[PDB]
Design a protein around this ligand. Structure first.
Ligand SMILES: [Mg+2]
Ligand SMILES: [Mg+2]
Ligand SMILES: [Mg+2]
Ligand SMILES: [Mg+2]
Ligand SMILES: [Mg+2]
Ligand SMILES: [Mg+2]
Ligand SMILES: [Mg+2]
Ligand SMILES: [Mg+2]
Ligand SMILES: [Mg+2]
Ligand SMILES: [Mg+2]
Ligand SMILES: [Mg+2]
Ligand SMILES: [Mg+2]
Ligand SMILES: [Mg+2]
Ligand SMILES: [Mg+2]
Ligand SMILES: [Mg+2]
Ligand SMILES: [Mg+2]
Ligand SMILES: [Mg+2]
Ligand SMILES: [Mg+2]
Ligand SMILES: [Mg+2]
Ligand SMILES: [Mg+2]
Ligand SMILES: [Mg+2]
Ligand SMILES: [Mg+2]
Ligand SMILES: [Mg+2]
Ligand SMILES: [Mg+2]
Ligand SMILES: [Mg+2]
Ligand SMILES: [Mg+2]
Ligand SMILES: [Mg+2]
Ligand SMILES: [Mg+2]
Ligand SMILES: [Mg+2]
Ligand SMILES: [Mg+2]
Ligand SMILES: [Mg+2]
Ligand SMILES: [Mg+2]
Ligand SMILES: [Mg+2]
Ligand SMILES: [Mg+2]
Ligand SMILES: [Mg+2]
Ligand SMILES: [Mg+2]
Ligand SMILES: [Mg+2]
Ligand SMILES: [Mg+2]
Ligand SMILES: [Mg+2]
Ligand SMILES: [Mg+2]
Ligand SMILES: [Zn+2]
Lengths: 158, 122, 59, 134, 86, 50, 135, 52
RNA sequence: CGCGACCUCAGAUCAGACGUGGCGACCCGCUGAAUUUAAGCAUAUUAGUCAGCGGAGGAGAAGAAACUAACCAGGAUUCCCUCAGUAACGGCGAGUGAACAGGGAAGAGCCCAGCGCCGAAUCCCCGCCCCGCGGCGGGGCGCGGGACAUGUGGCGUACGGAA
RNA sequence: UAAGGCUAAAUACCGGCACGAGACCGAUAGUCAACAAGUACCGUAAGGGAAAGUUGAAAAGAACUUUGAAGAGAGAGUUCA
RNA sequence: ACCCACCCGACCCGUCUUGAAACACGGACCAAGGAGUCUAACACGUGCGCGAGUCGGGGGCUCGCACGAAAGCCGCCGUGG
RNA sequence: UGGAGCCGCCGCAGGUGCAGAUCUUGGUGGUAGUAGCAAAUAUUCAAACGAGAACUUUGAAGGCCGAAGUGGAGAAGGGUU
RNA sequence: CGACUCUUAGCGGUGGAUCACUCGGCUCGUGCGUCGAUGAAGAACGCAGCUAGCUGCGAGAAUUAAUGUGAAUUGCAGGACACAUUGAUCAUCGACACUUCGAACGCACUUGCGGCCCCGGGUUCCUCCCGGGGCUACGCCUGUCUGAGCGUCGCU
């Protein structure tokens, strides 16, 4: 029964909720586990960025977010076509590619081509064998860095 | 007095049997003697003879089964006994050669578009 | 005797003959309330039971 | 402290480990120090005590400078019986009184081949650590 | 009569020893158990008797195969080999 | 009953073997907590798995 | 359809649940068809089914099955996914094309129930007091 | 129950304020002596040392 | 009144394989209450919850848009934080109740049928040799059987593809 | 771009094997269960289901004498007790 | 504070009840056990920090955690509330 | 008396204080050496053993069941009686 | 004073509170994440020199082999062993073994009845008889052999 003034309030504890309470005593143990697993994955992908692949710049949807810009899922095909990277290869050099992205405006396209161009400049493709063929960079830019890149690769700053 | 595994390994098959028989006889008499009092001195042996009997029988089965899996090592179909028991499910895994069969389409993919070792910022 | 519970009279007869080089008239088994199949074994009249009894140890 | 995160430091766990210990493990638990004399000679602090070592009892009632030969090792009872370490029961019969191995000192070892190789292994590890420390 | 005098004529039995579960619950006329359902291919268990469930779970018995499987696994399901001999 | 099956007879036999009282040398063992058998079944009171 | 198996009527309860006649099973007949083909041939691994006709009384179906342990399937790489033991009893778990449809999962606004794995899982997620450490 | 609110979370400035307060009174011989520490013969109370 | 193809069907203690039961904390598919709340009760609620049946795996399920949106647009699934006790449902009472966006954990994408081209270029089992053999495989050689044109294999699948 | 299909990862885990810890309980508590417990015992059956830890550092657990048919005592002795 | 004596006073507690010494119920006696808890949401009061802001989660970076499943830090410091 | 751990102060935390619940588990009284050991006719003498005899055994006498039996054998059930 | 009753204290009983211990629980976390026709889980019955229960094992039955260890096990016996030797005793466990029921499999649940191949006594393949051994569940797939049909054809 209500007594003199207060929010006529509806709690949702009518089902058997104590049967499905989910505690968080994991979380520290979890946080570590992720972190180990993270450091392992770095070490496996030895000079490759820990991050992942490079990802496009992309505007959010809706009037609300609109003004901001994130990393997207992957670079469109037009953006790869214009940059001149064969889509099947782009995956092999650490360039995210989605193929479901349309491309409406040319301002978002040329920006994302520029991204890939810049990436290709500051990328150090190792040759397949220690014996060096084409494409593969010099042993100078190799000895001076077989270095991983900490954090997201070429980060987007709005 | 002591019958060891050590020596029995080399011995001939007929020779192993006679030895087992002679222990089986010796076991009988002690069992007889346990009924009629006998003596603590006898009622030790009964445990000893039992284990020496086992030591004999064991050597025989090891020899018979070693020879057997020599005889089939090579043949495709072999007795279930001699086939390798791991775990029901584990005997239905894919074959070790069968699970690394690439489709020609997948092989071609690995040939044309291999993942490359690369780094960034230079 | 006390005998293994799985045994037929035929088997006992054959065992008694084999072990003690003897020869049987008839075997006559029962089961003790304890679990151990007992066996009364009549030896053929050429043989004396007390003589074999002395051979096997018992008396 | 102990930092190894697979050891235990848990009364109940250590005691259970102890009392329900298996013979070969008890051998190690039932160890006893060498006399300073032997400590000098072999380069070994202590040794697993055995059926017929010569031994002094250091503490208790039987604490004394006599050197009694070991009589038996009752690993179930965590104890060793020693030559003249005994007590007359009600009816005159002598009874070998138990002494715990660690409250005893080995003056003379019973050296077999294996005991010889053990002492060679312990002395070598001791001198490796002194070389590492230096 | 309903009571003590009628306890008098309990001369004959319903159940006997079931040969799967071992319980004295094999109903002779029905020729089924009512404990494991014997003739029934699958074992009888019900989720309401959690106490009953626990009374013959796995752990309970010998686990004579299953206890050496656990050991076998531990060290790695190695087969047909020995340790280096002397 | 005097008309037994073999199944039942064997069952009874084991039950008959289980009844015996403790061997007194057991009392003298090292870590002994056992003083009496406590699983002793008298036919006149308590009536079998049957 | 599916009449409610209760003696006479006698679905004792609140008269919401009094229904016995006009009510209808969740899975399709085609799924039931597969499930039965699966039941019967335990070794065989149900792949998929199709329709071949319908009377008033019956429907007919044709369930494609596969030996997971016939070398021609085992060694063909493109099929050897069915030989994996997660794909035991697809039809029983609601995993063939047919029995997928009852589960009520597809992308987009017309679903939401089944916005974890499945119907059950979303409910599970939605009715967990997540009780955090610090709150 | 397990889901008793065990952990207790504190505003960050407040945490810092406490840690400043403790530092500030790690000076003050009185507060150090009162906390029991026999600091009678020590040469200087915010006691700082060489970095060997 | 034969013999021979095939089709559809039987029988074999035929050769060689698999399936059956268990466990069930977690998982997938069905099935499915009533105490209870509403200060009575029938819709509602309890609840797609307990019990019931089925089937799994080390996880399962899901998953590469017949999606979101309506923006200057995002771009598989799962998970967390938020959205939000909100939009909505409801004897509009009791009560119930999501999603997108946004930020993170992770991050990976692919293959058929078809349409077409390629002497079925494909597969299984036999038998002889060399290696290898405690996850039955490689290589060779057999007018040695069979599957298959009522369609096997290579190329190829919407991000276009072929010539 | 539906009416065919495969796919690791972050996710779950009061069952299992093997460990680690605790501002928990300390034998009417904590698991039914610290012990020969799902035991004894009950019930035709489904099922129900206990009680029960502690001599001492060491058994050194009371030789011997004596009263009594004996259980029981009286002295003696062991033990720091 | 142990016992006894004497003068005066003085019905048995608990409880429901307008009213209990009640011919109202519960209570032979002693030991141990035994009932306003925790979570969530709201409101007001009070204490502290910061203040047109505040915030910490969730996540991440720093360790094999002995003490740590803590402590610290974050253009994430603010997606967001 | 006992024989191995325990307390003061400042803070924090709670499964924190019992006379009652026809409360729970265990124990103990008064009642009380009380009720009670009364269905179905019956016992007596001597001896033996024996620490010890109303009750055992043997002998003698007196009695009962009175072959629809208090006799002689099974079924079921018990499970070593 | 007498007996009895009441009260207090001493000592003794009854009873097992309290306190002190704890090889047990309860909770949180970590890693791994493995049963089965090659017979699972579960049940039964067995097995020790003296052993009933718990445990441990399976007719090789408180265990065999192997490897590691290196003198015990021990309630009492007895023993072994040369503990300068594969060597007691534990641990591990890769070899061997694993009675009967049980999905449970020749058919039945009496523990009853069988069939078919081979072996030893029995014969001198004479079938009997006895004993031993190996097969003999259902469903299903790939092939194989034997077939069936006024099913569709061809040739005769
Ligand atoms: Mg990331
Ligand atoms: Mg292809
Ligand atoms: Mg009776
Ligand atoms: Mg309703
Ligand atoms: Mg549809
Ligand atoms: Mg199953
Ligand atoms: Mg109501
Ligand atoms: Mg009401
Ligand atoms: Mg009502
Ligand atoms: Mg509902
Ligand atoms: Mg359920
Ligand atoms: Mg999956
Ligand atoms: Mg799709
Ligand atoms: Mg989405
Ligand atoms: Mg809000
Ligand atoms: Mg609802
Ligand atoms: Mg094609
Ligand atoms: Mg799938
Ligand atoms: Mg207790
Ligand atoms: Mg107690
Ligand atoms: Mg308790
Ligand atoms: Mg106590
Ligand atoms: Mg006590
Ligand atoms: Mg006590
Ligand atoms: Mg004392
Ligand atoms: Mg009232
Ligand atoms: Mg009134
Ligand atoms: Mg009153
Ligand atoms: Mg009145
Ligand atoms: Mg009342
Ligand atoms: Mg009363
Ligand atoms: Mg109290
Ligand atoms: Mg306030
Ligand atoms: Mg003490
Ligand atoms: Mg507490
Ligand atoms: Mg009280
Ligand atoms: Mg009287
Ligand atoms: Mg008679
Ligand atoms: Mg008194
Ligand atoms: Mg008690
Ligand atoms: Zn049963």
């Amino acid at each position: 029964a209500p007594s003199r003034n207060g929010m006529i309030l509806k709690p949702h504890f009518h089902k058997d909720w104590q049967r499905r309470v989910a505690t968080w005593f994991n979380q520290p143990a979890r946080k570590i586990r992720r972190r180990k697993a993270r450091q392992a994955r770095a070490r496996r992908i030895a000079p490759r960025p820990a991050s992942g692949p490079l990802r496009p710049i992309v505007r959010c949807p809706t009037v609300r977010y609109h003004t901001k810009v994130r990393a997207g899922r992957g670079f469109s095909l037009e953006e790869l076509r214009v940059a001149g990277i064969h889509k099947k290869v782009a995956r092999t050099i650490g360039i995210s590619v989605d193929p479901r992205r349309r491309n409406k405006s040319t301002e978002s396209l040329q920006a994302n081509v520029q991204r890939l161009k810049e990436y290709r400049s500051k990328l150090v493709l190792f040759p397949r064998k220690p014996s060096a063929p084409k494409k593969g960079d010099s042993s100078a830019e190799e000895l001076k860095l077989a270095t991983q890149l900490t954090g997201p690769v070429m980060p987007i700053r709005n | 007095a002591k019958i060891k595994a050590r020596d029995l390994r080399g011995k001939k098959k007929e020779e192993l049997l006679k030895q087992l028989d002679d222990l089986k006889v010796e076991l009988s008499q002690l069992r007889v003697a346990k009924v009629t009092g006998g003596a603590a001195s006898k009622l030790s042996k009964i445990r000893v003879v039992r284990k020496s009997i086992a030591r004999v029988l064991t050597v025989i089965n090891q020899t018979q089964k070693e020879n057997l899996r020599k005889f089939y090592k090579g043949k495709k179909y072999k007795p279930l006994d001699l086939r390798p028991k791991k775990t029901r499910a584990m005997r239905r895994r894919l074959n070790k050669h069968e699970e690394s069969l690439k489709t020609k389409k997948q092989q071609r993919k690995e040939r044309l578009y291999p993942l490359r070792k690369y780094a960034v910022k230079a | 005797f006390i005998v293994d519970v799985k045994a037929n009279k035929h088997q006992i007869k054959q065992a008694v003959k084999k072990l003690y080089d003897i020869d049987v008239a008839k075997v006559n088994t029962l089961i003790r309330p304890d679990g151990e199949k007992k066996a009364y074994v009549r030896l053929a009249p050429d043989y004396d039971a007390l003589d074999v009894a002395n051979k096997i140890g018992i008396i | 402290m102990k930092f190894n995160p697979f050891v235990t430091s848990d009364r109940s766990k250590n005691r259970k480990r102890h009392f329900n210990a298996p013979s070969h493990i008890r051998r190690k638990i039932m160890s006893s120090p060498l006399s300073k004399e032997l400590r000098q000679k072999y380069n070994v602090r202590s040794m697993p005590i055995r059926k017929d070592d010569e031994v002094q009892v250091v503490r208790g009632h039987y604490k004394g400078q006599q050197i009694g030969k070991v009589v038996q090792v009752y690993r179930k009872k965590y104890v060793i019986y020693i030559e003249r370490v005994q007590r007359e029961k009600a009816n005159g019969t002598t009874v070998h009184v138990g002494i715990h191995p660690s409250k005893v000192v080995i003056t003379r070892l019973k050296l077999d081949k294996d005991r010889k190789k053990i002492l060679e292994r312990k002395a070598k590890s001791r001198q490796v650590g002194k070389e590492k420390g230096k | 009569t309903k009571g003590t005098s009628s306890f008098g004529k309990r001369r004959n039995k319903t159940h006997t020893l079931c040969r799967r579960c071992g319980s004295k619950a094999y109903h002779l006329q029905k020729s089924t158990c009512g404990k494991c359902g014997y003739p029934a291919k699958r074992k009888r268990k019900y989720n309401w008797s959690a106490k009953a469930k626990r009374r013959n779970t796995t752990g309970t018995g010998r686990m004579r195969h299953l206890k050496i499987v656990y050991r076998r696994f531990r060290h790695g399901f190695r087969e047909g080999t020995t340790p280096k001999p002397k | 009953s005097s008309h037994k099956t073999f199944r039942i007879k064997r069952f009874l036999a084991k039950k008959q073997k289980q009844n015996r009282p403790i061997p007194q040398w057991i009392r003298m063992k090292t870590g002994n907590k056992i003083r009496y058998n406590s699983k002793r079944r008298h036919w006149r009171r308590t009536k079998l798995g049957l | 359809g599916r009449k409610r198996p209760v003696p006479k009527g006698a679905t004792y309860g609140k008269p919401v649940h009094h229904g016995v006649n006009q009510l209808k099973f969740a899975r399709s007949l085609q799924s039931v068809a597969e499930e039965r083909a699966g039941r019967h041939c335990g070794a065989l691994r149900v792949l998929n089914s199709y329709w071949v006709g319908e009377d008033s009384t019956y429907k007919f179906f044709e369930v494609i099955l596969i030996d997971p342990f016939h070398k021609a399937i085992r060694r063909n790489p493109d099929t050897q996914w069915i030989t994996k033991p997660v794909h035991k009893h697809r039809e029983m778990r609601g995993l063939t094309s047919a029995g997928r449809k009852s589960r009520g999962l597809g992308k987009g606004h017309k679903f939401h129930h089944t916005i974890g794995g499945s119907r059950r899982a979303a409910w599970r997620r939605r009715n967990t007091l997540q009780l955090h450490r610090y709150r | 129950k397990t889901w008793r609110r065990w952990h207790r979370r504190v505003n960050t400035t407040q945490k810092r304020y406490a840690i400043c307060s403790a530092l500030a009174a790690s000076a003050l011989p009185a507060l150090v002596m009162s906390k029991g520490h026999r600091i009678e013969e020590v040469p200087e109370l915010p006691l700082v040392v060489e970095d060997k």
